[PDB]
């Protein structure tokens, strides 16, 4: 059953969790090709592994910048968790290493580009299109949460479309293993649950709220709570009054009212029936959950793939020289990486 799958999944995860892979490649093994994305303290580049000719996305984090932004522990979380998990819709970490200046996470390259890119361009997804992606997040969160993991950064920018049109979740920078509650104010404004904003201490239920935000944004073409500045976004979230496009079906609205539920005793995903309140909701009536996991369902959208290591589905970013100091930086802080 689901329970059986999950029990076995957990056993595999804990082995890697307790004994993480470390220093499994070196910079000189990769040819650097192109920047695919940037973040507050680093960049992700398309690289080619010289000995296999495989393409990977190499996330390069400047140690000194991580330290300045107080993301040391989050960064250690990310690598330790990412190296340990295994789910069809989770991007795979293939290698990790560090040098005098940087940390490196070499991950599977997902050529179809960000959901963000396609969503913005097309405007909004049909309900069946949105339902397809949503189901994959439902299962991914069922998996992560069963491992006591909170993801904490669901948004289209972090969901890549693979060559078969299925989702790959990336960016585990805020992922955290925690039993009970946690308090870090982190995430992206549009997607924060009310309890995060209110410093109430929070749990996995924030991911189910974020799911509510994602489905709304996918189906409407804009998020349920937006403004020009984050503070204004928080005020909208906390009041929690949500208006739905007139094209939203009755089922969709009912599902969203239960996900975008301020009352934790009522928020779907968080009740006695757990994720089943969601899987069995009317909006998902047409969803075959096993077919989704098995990747047997036909994707509403297949990205254009002009060749191996092609980057047409990504935006262009300014390229910077990757410099490595002749002195070790922040060795102690990242000793476990």
């Amino acid at each position: 059953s689901v329970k059986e799958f999950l029990a076995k999944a957990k056993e595999d995860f804990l082995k890697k969790w307790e004994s993480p892979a470390q220093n499994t490649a070196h910079l000189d093994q990769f040819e650097r090709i192109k920047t695919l994305g940037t973040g507050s303290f680093g960049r992700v580049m398309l690289v080619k592994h010289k000995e296999t000719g495989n393409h990977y996305a190499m996330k390069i984090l400047d140690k000194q910048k991580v330290v300045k932004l107080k993301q040391i522990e989050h960064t250690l979380n990310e690598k330790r968790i990412l190296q340990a998990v295994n789910f069809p819709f989770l991007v795979k970490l293939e290698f990790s290493f560090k040098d005098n200046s940087n940390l490196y996470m070499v991950m599977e390259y997902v050529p179809g580009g960000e959901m963000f890119s396609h969503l913005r361009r097309i405007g909004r997804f049909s309900e069946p299109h949105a339902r397809f992606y949503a189901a994959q997040i439902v299962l991914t969160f069922e998996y992560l949460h069963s491992l006591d993991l909170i993801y904490r950064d669901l948004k289209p920018e972090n969901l890549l479309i693979d060559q078969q049109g299925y989702i790959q979740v990336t960016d585990f920078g805020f992922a955290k293993r925690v039993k009970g509650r946690t308090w870090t104010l982190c995430g992206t404004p549009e997607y924060l649950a009310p309890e995060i904003i209110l410093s109430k201490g929070y749990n996995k239920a924030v991911d189910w709220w974020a799911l509510g935000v994602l489905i709304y944004e996918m189906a409407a073409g804009y998020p349920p709570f937006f403004a020009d500045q984050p503070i204004q976004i928080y005020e909208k979230i906390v009041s929690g009054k949500v208006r739905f496009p007139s094209h939203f079906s009755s089922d969709l609205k009912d599902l969203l009212r239960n996900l975008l539920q301020v009352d934790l005793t009522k928020r779907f995903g968080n009740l006695k029936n757990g994720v089943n309140d969601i899987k069995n909701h009317k909006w998902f009536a047409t969803t075959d959950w096993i077919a989704i996991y098995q990747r047997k369902v036909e994707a509403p959208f297949i990205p254009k793939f002009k060749g191996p290591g092609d980057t047409s589905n990504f935006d262009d970013y300014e390229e910077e020289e990757i410099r490595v100091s002749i002195n070790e930086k922040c060795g102690k802080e990242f000793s476990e990486f």
Partner: peptide, 19 residues
């Protein structure tokens, strides 16, 4: 329309995480 309001807003680009 709400769509028009969104498109004209400053947050249709990639949204950064907060720390």
């Amino acid at each position: 329309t709400t769509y028009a309001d969104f498109i004209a807003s400053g947050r249709t680009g990639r949204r950064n995480a907060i720390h």
